[PDB]
Amino acid sequence: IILTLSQGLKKYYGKILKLLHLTLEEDTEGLLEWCKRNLGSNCDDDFFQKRIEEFFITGEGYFNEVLQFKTEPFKSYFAKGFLSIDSGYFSAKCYPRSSTSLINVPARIAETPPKTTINCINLRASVFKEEVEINVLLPQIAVNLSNCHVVINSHVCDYSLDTDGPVRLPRIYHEGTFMPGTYKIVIDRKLNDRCTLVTNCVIKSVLRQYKTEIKIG
Amino acid sequence: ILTLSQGLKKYYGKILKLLHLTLEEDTEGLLEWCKRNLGSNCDDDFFQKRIEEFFITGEGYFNEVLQFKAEPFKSYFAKGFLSIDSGYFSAKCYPRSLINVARIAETPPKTSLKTINCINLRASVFKEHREVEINVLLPQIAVNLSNCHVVINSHVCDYSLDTDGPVRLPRIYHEGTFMPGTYKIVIDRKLNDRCTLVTNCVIKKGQSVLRQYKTEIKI
Ligand SMILES: *[C@@H]1O[C@H](CO)[C@@H](O)[C@H](O)[C@H]1NC(C)=O
Ligand SMILES: *[C@@H]1O[C@H](CO)[C@@H](O)[C@H](O)[C@H]1NC(C)=O
Ligand SMILES: *[C@@H]1O[C@H](CO)[C@@H](O)[C@H](O)[C@H]1NC(C)=O
Ligand SMILES: *[C@@H]1O[C@H](CO)[C@@H](O)[C@H](O)[C@H]1NC(C)=O
Known part of the structure; x- marks a missing residue:
């Protein structure tokens, strides 16, 4: 008990x-x-x-x-x-605020006509010959992983995820729900063969939305 | 070679x-x-x-x-x-992954650190162990140390100082001179006996005119 x-x-x-x-x-x-x-x-x-x-x-x-x-x-x-x-x-x-100097949490975007090296306004893909990072800029728009093992970094909390489905982001409650403004998803190419990310690629000052399945490896 | x-x-x-x-x-x-x-x-x-x-x-x-x-x-x-x-x-x-860098009027004490009534200085004593930190808010106003060994922390670079005189802060050149917005001065009381810091304590509504008087912080 003790x-x-x-x-x-x-x-x-x-x-x-x-x-x-x-x-x-x-x-x-x-x-x-x-x-x-x-x-x-x-x-x-x-x-x-x-x-x-x-x-x-x-x-x-x-x-x-x-x-x-x-104090x-x-x-x-x-x-x-x-x-x-x-x-x-x-x-x-x-990481505490003592280390930092989080948004106050949206709308649904219209649909545009491929679903399967991308050209998204919301996504920033970088490839390090040393891993693959898919930085996202719209945290409310979810990026569901499938059969994957990633590590997500942010200015609020870094951690690794393996559960398939919606990415779980920290949410602080203080007069409302505060979620991070952007997070980065690193993927180790050398176990992550069947990893598939299903997201909503944003195309352009009105914005558009179409689903895409980005697979690594 | x-x-x-x-x-x-x-x-x-x-x-x-x-x-x-x-x-x-x-x-x-x-x-x-x-x-x-x-x-x-x-x-x-x-x-x-x-x-x-x-x-x-x-x-x-x-x-x-x-x-x-x-x-x-x-x-x-x-x-x-x-x-x-x-x-x-x-x-x-640390990479970003800085202010751009005036004279204040004079006001009529010359020397503890538990009370220094400085708008420019925030003195904290951590009885949590054995250390003293004197946060500064106006980096342009310099704080000269004398017979002292400090370690200064900042959002741009942490390092230790022992040279007596003005505290040396990093200066980045990009369309001008950029210096850190604020730095922290930690002093371990448990060799740092003869440490004297001379700074400009800031005294004195939004209509308040700003004032300045010299002070010598003894540890
Ligand atoms: C966050 O946004 C909500 C929106 O209704 C608002 O009521 C609340 O005061 C905001 N809180 C802060 C800390 O900005
Ligand atoms: C992620 O899963 C949720 C829950 O099923 C779904 O509503 C959402 O549309 C998925 N993400 C995308 C970009 O479709
Ligand atoms: C600092 O001043 C210089 C000179 O006017 C200017 O070029 C520069 O943009 C300024 N930087 C900031 C951050 O204000
Ligand atoms: C520190 O040394 C400088 C050297 O020019 C001197 O002008 C200044 O009065 C001294 N004290 C402070 C608080 O800067």
């Missing part, structure tokens, strides 16, 4: 990741006693939501691994670059 | 001198290292452009030679930051 320091931290990280809408499952059993024994405060959804908000926006100086700022085992506050929120089943490298 | 590592350190030395971070350099044999390894000329124009592309208009990946896009620097396996280390001075410079 949870150790690392186990309680991993459960704390697991719930924070689920509120970020990065994972679809969680394991948060036993977190109430770990908080009231180490943190000393309640760990309800309000506590976490405020912690996520304070971390990604309105950040102030240093913090701790429990994502607490200040017993987590009182050292030797963290300002980034924080590695790792629950054991899914890891994420999240 | 200079080896690969030695040529890189001299390459870093010239970039550091152009950044106005160091006052001395060792660049003898650097042109031969460039035309033999880089394949391009290594004049002040070449370096100035490399500094320009690195700190502004940066786009994606680069190499330790500050080039963006047997050729030992064609793999472009470098992201995040670059450690410009010449052997005599190290600096962790």
Whole structure:
């Protein structure tokens, strides 16, 4: 029943990741006693939501691994670059606002007449002979992966995805829903053979929309 | 003739001198290292452009030679930051992946840091361990250290200083002189006993006229 320091931290990280809408499952059993024994405060959804908000926006100086700022085992506050929120089943490298100097979340675009090296206003494809990166500029327009293993980078949180379907982006709640403005999807060509991305390619100052299936390898 | 590592350190030395971070350099044999390894000329124009592309208009990946896009620097396996280390001075410079750079009136204290009432300075003491940070908000107004060893952080480049006098900040040239918008000065109290920082404390509604009085921060 009693949870150790690392186990309680991993459960704390697991719930924070689920509120970020990065994972679809969680394991948060036993977190109430770990908080009231180490943190000393309640760990309800309000506590976490405020912690996520304070971390990604309105950040102030240093913090701790429990994502607490200040203007017993987590009182050292030797963290300002980034924080590695790792629950054991899914890891994420999240960057605080203290490192950055997120949009406030749309419309549906009309249809234009190929669905299968592209020419999209919303997509930027780069090929490094060293991998393939497909940067997107319209994060609300989704890019569903299929039979793929990617790592997506951003200015809010970097992490790797293998679940097929819609890409899960972090979403902060502070007077509304805040989503990143743009994210980049890197794909290792050397296991990713049958990887297919289905997206909506945008053609031009009115914009147009047509589906396309971009496959790598 | 200079080896690969030695040529890189001299390459870093010239970039550091152009950044106005160091006052001395060792660049003898650097042109031969460039035309033999880089394949391009290594004049002040070449370096100035490399500094320009690195700190502004940066786009994606680069190499330790500050080039963006047997050729030992064609793999472009470098992201995040670059450690410009010449052997005599190290600096962790971050690419964008800067202000453009007035006199304030005078007001009538001459010396703790718990209270300095400065609009230009934000003094924090981290009892969280053993360190003192004095954030500055007006980089043009200089803070001269005396008998001190600090490490200054910024959004352009982190490095440590021990030379007494004005703090040396990076300066990028692109249609003008660009300096960082704000820098942080950390001081480890646990060798840094005789440290004295002399700065211009800013005192005194939106209609408030701006004022200035000298102050000597003792640690
Ligand atoms: C975000 O947008 C919503 C739109 O209704 C608005 O109500 C809210 O105040 C905005 N929040 C911020 C922080 O801009
Ligand atoms: C991604 O999947 C969702 C859910 O089925 C779908 O509505 C959307 O159209 C897909 N993406 C594109 C670009 O079609
Ligand atoms: C700085 O001033 C110079 C000289 O007028 C100008 O060319 C340059 O665009 C300015 N840069 C910024 C960022 O204001
Ligand atoms: C620092 O040194 C310069 C040297 O010219 C001097 O003018 C200035 O008054 C000193 N103090 C400050 C706060 O800059």
